[PDB]
Design a protein around this ligand. Sequence first.
Ligand SMILES: *[C@@H]1O[C@H](CO[C@H]2O[C@@H](C)[C@@H](O)[C@@H](O)[C@@H]2O)[C@@H](O[C@@H]2O[C@H](CO)[C@@H](O[C@@H]3O[C@H](CO)[C@@H](O)[C@H](O)[C@@H]3O)[C@H](O)[C@H]2NC(C)=O)[C@H](O)[C@H]1NC(C)=O
Ligand SMILES: *[C@@H]1O[C@H](CO[C@H]2O[C@@H](C)[C@@H](O)[C@@H](O)[C@@H]2O)[C@@H](O[C@@H]2O[C@H](CO)[C@@H](O[C@@H]3O[C@H](CO)[C@@H](O)[C@H](O)[C@@H]3O)[C@H](O)[C@H]2NC(C)=O)[C@H](O)[C@H]1NC(C)=O
Ligand SMILES: CCCCCCCCO[C@@H]1O[C@H](CO)[C@@H](O)[C@H](O)[C@H]1O
Ligand SMILES: CCCCCCCCO[C@@H]1O[C@H](CO)[C@@H](O)[C@H](O)[C@H]1O
Ligand SMILES: *[C@@H]1O[C@H](CO)[C@@H](O)[C@H](O)[C@H]1NC(C)=O
Ligand SMILES: *[C@@H]1O[C@H](CO)[C@@H](O)[C@H](O)[C@H]1NC(C)=O
Lengths: 394, 394
Amino acid sequence: MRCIGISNRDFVEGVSGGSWVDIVLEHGSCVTTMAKNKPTLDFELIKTEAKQPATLRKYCIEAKLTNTTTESRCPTQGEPTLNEEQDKRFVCKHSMVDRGWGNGCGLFGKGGIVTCAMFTCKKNMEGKIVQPENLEYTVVITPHSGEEHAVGNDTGKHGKEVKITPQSSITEAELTGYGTVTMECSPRTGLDFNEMVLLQMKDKAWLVHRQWFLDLPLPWLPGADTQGSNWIQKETLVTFKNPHAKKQDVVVLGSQEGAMHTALTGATEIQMSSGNLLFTGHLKCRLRMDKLQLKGMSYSMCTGKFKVVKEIAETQHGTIVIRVQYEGDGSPCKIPFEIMDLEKRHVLGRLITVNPIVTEKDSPVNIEAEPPFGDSYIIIGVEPGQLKLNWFKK
Amino acid sequence: MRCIGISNRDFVEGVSGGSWVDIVLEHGSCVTTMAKNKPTLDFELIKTEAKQPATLRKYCIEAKLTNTTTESRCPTQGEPTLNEEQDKRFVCKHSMVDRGWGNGCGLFGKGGIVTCAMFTCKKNMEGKIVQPENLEYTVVITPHSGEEHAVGNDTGKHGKEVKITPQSSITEAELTGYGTVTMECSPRTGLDFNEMVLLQMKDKAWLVHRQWFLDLPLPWLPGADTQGSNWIQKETLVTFKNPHAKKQDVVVLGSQEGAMHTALTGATEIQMSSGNLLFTGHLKCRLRMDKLQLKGMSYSMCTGKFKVVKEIAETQHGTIVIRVQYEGDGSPCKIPFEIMDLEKRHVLGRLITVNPIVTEKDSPVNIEAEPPFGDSYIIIGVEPGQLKLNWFKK
Ligand SMILES: *[C@@H]1O[C@H](CO[C@H]2O[C@@H](C)[C@@H](O)[C@@H](O)[C@@H]2O)[C@@H](O[C@@H]2O[C@H](CO)[C@@H](O[C@@H]3O[C@H](CO)[C@@H](O)[C@H](O)[C@@H]3O)[C@H](O)[C@H]2NC(C)=O)[C@H](O)[C@H]1NC(C)=O
Ligand SMILES: *[C@@H]1O[C@H](CO[C@H]2O[C@@H](C)[C@@H](O)[C@@H](O)[C@@H]2O)[C@@H](O[C@@H]2O[C@H](CO)[C@@H](O[C@@H]3O[C@H](CO)[C@@H](O)[C@H](O)[C@@H]3O)[C@H](O)[C@H]2NC(C)=O)[C@H](O)[C@H]1NC(C)=O
Ligand SMILES: CCCCCCCCO[C@@H]1O[C@H](CO)[C@@H](O)[C@H](O)[C@H]1O
Ligand SMILES: CCCCCCCCO[C@@H]1O[C@H](CO)[C@@H](O)[C@H](O)[C@H]1O
Ligand SMILES: *[C@@H]1O[C@H](CO)[C@@H](O)[C@H](O)[C@H]1NC(C)=O
Ligand SMILES: *[C@@H]1O[C@H](CO)[C@@H](O)[C@H](O)[C@H]1NC(C)=O
């Protein structure tokens, strides 16, 4: 009954006769399944975890320059030299500046100069490769028990969590008291994980095209890298200036964090917060129910009377939910329930919370049902003090 | 002699007869002035200071969100409320989320929710208005004294610094021993300081168009602001998400420092380093020299002989500089100097360091001159041991 209240809720039924139904689950979605003489079940995808992906590449988005050093020669004395030209942590550039008596040389002319500065990354983002085969999904299965506190309860302590791995065969789920259900889920698509990259910048994350990702004009490190200091193409976050031929300067280019966010505007978002998976694709599972059975079909219709404990309320999909309490001494018994026409002559609506049964004299029971458009009567209990509640839909 | 060595050096002469010459100075530039019976002078613009300009607007480029709070109502219960909706430091957004039994409401439906978070700027940039009227320029005037250590000496302790303010009348400069010169400088143009804004992001600075600046999609504060917390349009660095109608989130948009740098690529740069003014416009000054006079026109040509102390060297503009020392007993006397043709019959070149005079037996003297293209002889001193140095130009 976890789904009652969610608006992105889908109602699914199987092929008449068969005991297998196919459903699709996406974060933020909810699915209510039904089948002849089978308990109604609610399904919700709680999490999508990718177990250790490959780091295609690592980009620097904010850096710092330090230990600037420089060397220079006089006209006709060749190029200057710095050992830092070999230290892969440093970025360098050669250039010319004016020279002559006033600054040390015997000749006036252009003399070589070389400037180097240590480049240290302060913030970085990673591109990872995800393969469908290894994506674990956590799904919560909550059956329509009618339990006092189950309507829309997200605590998860009414449902049964199951972990599923796409290409790791069938998964078995034991629903206490109802039997056992089976799920065969398919990874295959929503999108292709070969030409796409999962990009992570702290708690934010998107799925982007490989090409686009590989063409980002930022300093980088190969996926395999550990040291995290020998960045390739540091020049992309650096700027060398020698405007008047007097001296050469180097300055960092400033955090690209936002520029990135701005360029990722049109990209598929995965999550903005630590534990708020937004999208993840559509998970398809085939549900087997031959080993699933209704609960209490050994009972007899109660004979006593009921009291409305929580007035009839309509959900965002036209179904109604009501909560009644038994006052009869029948103990474990089936609750009489039917939706009749204005004159109580013919039956018009169906139960979603099929096989409503009391379990304890004082444990109220929730019943979801689908009345017909227009007028109808909700008849609860049997004759002596039988509840006859009128309702109008949509 | 400060200019000897700089490549962006310009040689300027006045209208024959007049004693007024016009020059143009720009950072990274140098100007050598000459005039009949007047000392040759070198001019260099050392600094451009804008005295307390007006802050047109202040933009936030990096922010932080904190103290997130939220309020919500049930379907049909109207809008939620937070006092932070009035606290100008907070950014807020109203929205809907699903409600029903499982999360507190008696009815299932869409209920109002409102979310607020405190927005605190961590880094910002300012746009300032510069008025030509109030721009102070520091200029160093260094005359061609021929002093042993003056060639290309940037120490500034050979020159005379003068501060100039465009529309504050004429400025008087006293050149020790040479008299006094006068400068009348004009602010008027390079560009229109009305439709342009000086933008500063730490030590970096550009001149940009007012419109473009005012249209930057960032959070701002009016120029006059002091508090620095009641940012207008905070929504531009913030993002509210309510993808599944379950709850609403807010996340900062990330430093725009680099994006700004990137958008400022084609803009006019003023400086990248704390004290490295790159550009500043072209400063025009009219130089009056009627009160300026040569030094030592009471002396007689030396009669002794000279020794070359620093061999003839050519500058990047075809002039040559030489340094000689006197061995004669003439004390304060004019140095005989001329550039003759191959046969020493006719005169061909001019002195830049006009009126070369010894001052102390042992103080070497530097002379800059402009020999003719091709062959020529540099004749120094008189007959007995007269220096006859051959030279070839360009
Ligand atoms: C979602 O479910 C939780 C807990 O689920 C269990 O609830 C019990 C009643 C039973 O159905 C079991 O099978 C479910 O898994 C709900 O939290 C529970 O709330 C009730 C009442 O608020 C608590 O019962 C007790 O009531 C007596 C009153 O006589 C008090 O003295 C006790 O202190 C206590 O409140 C019960 O302890 C809670 N159980 C847990 C695990 O916290 C929760 O309300 C529900 N969500 C909604 C909105 O329906
Ligand atoms: C730029 O100029 C500075 C100083 O300018 C002054 O220099 C003196 C000589 C004089 O012309 C005065 O009018 C100038 O304003 C040059 O620095 C000076 O360097 C000299 C020699 O290196 C120093 O002279 C002394 O020499 C005796 C040797 O007998 C030593 O014992 C002394 O310690 C001292 O070195 C003099 O002190 C320096 N003056 C200053 C203010 O530092 C500088 O070299 C020059 N730049 C170039 C490259 O030409
Ligand atoms: C089509 C959507 C792209 C594939 C979705 C898989 C990405 C899962 O998202 C990532 O899962 C990690 C698992 O530990 C978490 O640590 C991260 O917080 C989360 O961003
Ligand atoms: C056409 C170029 C725009 C006008 C140039 C004037 C800007 C000088 O630039 C500013 O001067 C300030 C004065 O204190 C300094 O504090 C700053 O470091 C500097 O950026
Ligand atoms: C950079 O400077 C620091 C402090 O001056 C020094 O300790 C360090 O050795 C320098 N780094 C390198 C590799 O030159
Ligand atoms: C934000 O939270 C801090 C610490 O929890 C608290 O001291 C402060 O009062 C809060 N700020 C506001 C204005 O709500």
